[PDB]
Design a protein around this ligand. Structure first.
Ligand SMILES: CC[C@@H]([C@H](C)O)n1ncn(-c2ccc(N3CCN(c4ccc(OC[C@@H]5CO[C@@](Cn6cncn6)(c6ccc(F)cc6F)C5)cc4)CC3)cc2)c1=O
Ligand code: HEM
Length: 528
């Protein structure tokens, strides 16, 4: 008889429940630890699954090392399993596909196969507000990107360039970090100066003079509040009853409220021109089904667009300054270009003249290669995906992770990849371009192929639409920096390592540089 054993299960269950609440808790710990380790070992037997990176702590997965040095993580994984592999991240299984084929597999994936908004909505909806970007169907996103692109035209850029220049000179004149009319040399932290320069120039151009004027008041503090709410933690803890989160939410309401105030006032004046992104969205934000964006959605879309461009651009100009700080040879070469194109500084900078500064654009290009702001782009897998030329199947509920920034740093695709060399882009200074066929997902014709090893602006339906705005802003900014100042490192200092745990791969601060005026007696005019 074995029925005596079935009794003994029951008995065992009872004897278990009467263990001391000390031993019983550790069992509550030690059991999932063992099952996890067992499940992985069984998972490796499955060959329609990409290799899974081993980990001890359940749920947490490889979060720590991935968070701290994702490119070094990816390299070790790549050496062991090749380009396709999975790892556990805070409850989620990420399947990484490295290299150009990975770009193709994720960026060009079927709309039915993956979802970005499913990956990203928690990160962004709390910050931007409802109804826009990733809080709406992909088809709504496609048209929003079309609306915003409508204020990012060549003629807009011609009008923005002098507005941006004015803000940069204003910042050199009035900021305590510079004060060039009073000081001929000084030390700055680029992680302090660049976010300020960035929001000032982006506000003035995209949002207009009134909105820029508000950053000169206490209202600036709300931007700082909202800004602090744009962080990776939102991936895990989007909302939780703390101080941090209420300021953020308050800020969102307060800032969207201000844009709406301006919007409603411009319409109640028939004062709707072609100045800024606000005018533009007012005139052009009706979807194809005839539904119009609400004033709230318009305001929210403004916040999203300003916030995203804030962090990518601010990090990029910081890195540019940092790399040039140890390359007086490159500052020198850039200065010669400025003198040539602007006739010794006589000519006023314009959008057309910016396009005749290939070395400057190449410098932005090379900084975006060495410092892709977003080291990992995500999609949630919605339908089972088979990985071509493999037996691999990525089951729904997984996430795919693509990382062009990792490929940016591979010697195979960029010789001496960890060397800053703007001349690798000689006669190839364009922000990006297509090597063949194009396609349109609803916001303009863009490259069909996404196989370039250089993809700072992504590709496919979720491709950036800010690239030309960013080059315009970075271009004006760096053209004025170069013409006005030389700079270098404090003794024994050099380019800092990136902080891969922040929203963007900004430098680990404080990252200080020492500036000095090229023309000590040059004064910046205007009232203050
Ligand atoms: C827990 C213990 C801790 C210890 C120390 O290990 N740890 N362990 C692990 N980690 C860890 C691990 C990983 C990370 N992150 C990985 C994910 N990252 C990330 C960032 C942004 C992303 O943005 C998605 C969209 C794309 O478009 C944007 C952006 N944009 C594009 N153009 C302009 N803006 C956009 C678009 C349109 C708009 F209109 C606006 C927008 F914004 C938003 C996607 C991914 C951040 C870093 C951080 C920390 C830890 O910290
Ligand atoms: C150096 C500057 C920038 C870089 C490197 C950059 C990079 C990117 C990348 C990689 C994506 C695709 C994300 C994904 O596929 O998951 C993206 C998307 C996007 N970016 Fe940018 N970006 C920059 C600046 C800007 C600016 C200045 C704006 C607005 C003025 C902007 C607005 C957008 C928008 C609207 C999307 C679409 C997101 C989607 O369709 O899912 N970006 N950007």
């Amino acid at each position: 008889i074995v029925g005596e054993a079935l009794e003994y299960v029951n008995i065992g269950l009872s004897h278990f429940l009467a263990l001391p609440l000390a031993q019983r808790i550790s069992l509550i710990i030690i059991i999932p630890f063992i099952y996890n380790i067992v499940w992985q070992l069984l998972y490796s037997l499955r060959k329609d699954r990409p290799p899974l990176v081993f980990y001890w702590i359940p749920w947490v997965g490889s979060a720590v090392v991935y968070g701290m040095k994702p490119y070094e993580f990816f390299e070790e994984c790549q050496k062991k399993y090749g380009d396709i592999f999975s790892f556990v991240l805070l409850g989620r299984v990420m399947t990484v596909y490295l290299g150009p084929k990975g770009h193709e597999f994720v960026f060009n994936a079927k709309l039915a196969d993956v979802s970005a908004e499913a990956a990203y909505a928690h990160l962004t909806t709390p910050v931007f507000g409802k109804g826009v970007i990733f809080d709406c169907p992909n088809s709504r996103l496609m048209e929003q990107k079309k609306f915003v692109k409508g204020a990012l035209t060549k003629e807009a850029f011609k009008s923005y360039v002098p507005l941006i220049a004015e803000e940069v000179y204003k910042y050199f004149r009035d900021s305590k970090n510079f004060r060039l009319n009073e000081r001929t040399t000084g030390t700055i932290d680029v992680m302090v100066t660049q976010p300020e320069m960035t929001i000032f120039t982006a506000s003035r151009s995209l949002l207009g003079k009134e909105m820029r004027a508000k950053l000169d008041t206490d209202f600036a503090y709300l931007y700082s509040d909202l800004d602090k709410g744009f962080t990776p933690i939102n991936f895990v803890f989007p909302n939780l009853p703390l101080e941090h989160y209420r300021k953020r939410d308050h800020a969102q309401k307060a800032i969207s409220g201000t844009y709406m105030s301006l919007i409603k006032e411009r319409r109640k004046n028939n004062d709707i021109q072609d100045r800024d992104l606000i005018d533009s969205l007012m005139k052009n934000s009706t979807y194809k089904d005839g539904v119009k964006m609400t004033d709230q959605e318009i305001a929210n879309l403004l916040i999203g667009v300003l916030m995203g461009g804030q962090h990518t651009s601010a990090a990029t100009s910081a890195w540019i300054l940092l790399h040039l700080a140890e390359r007086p040879d490159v500052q020198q070469e850039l200065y010669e270009e400025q003198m040539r194109v602007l006739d010794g500084g006589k000519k006023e900078l314009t959008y057309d003249l910016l396009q005749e500064m290939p070395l400057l654009n190449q410098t932005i290009k090379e900084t975006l290669r060495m410092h892709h702001p977003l080291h990992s782009l995500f999609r949630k897998v919605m339908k089972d995906m088979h990985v071509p030329n493999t037996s691999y199947v990525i089951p729904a509920g997984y996430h795919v992770l693509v990382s062009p920034g990792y490929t940016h740093l591979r010697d195979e695709y960029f010789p001496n990849a960890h060397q800053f060399n703007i001349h690798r882009w000689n006669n190839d200074s364009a922000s990006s371009y297509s090597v063949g066929e194009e396609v349109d997902y609803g916001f303009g014709a863009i490259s069909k192929g996404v196989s370039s090893p250089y993809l700072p602006f992504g590709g496919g339906r979720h491709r950036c639409i800010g690239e030309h705005f960013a080059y315009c802003q970075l271009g004006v900014l760096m053209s004025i920096f170069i013409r006005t100042l030389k700079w270098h490192y404090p003794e024994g200092k050099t380019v800092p390592p990136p902080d891969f745990t922040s929203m963007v791969t900004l430098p680990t601060g404080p990252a200080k540089i020492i500036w000095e005026k090229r023309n000590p007696e040059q004064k910046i005019g205007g009232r203050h």
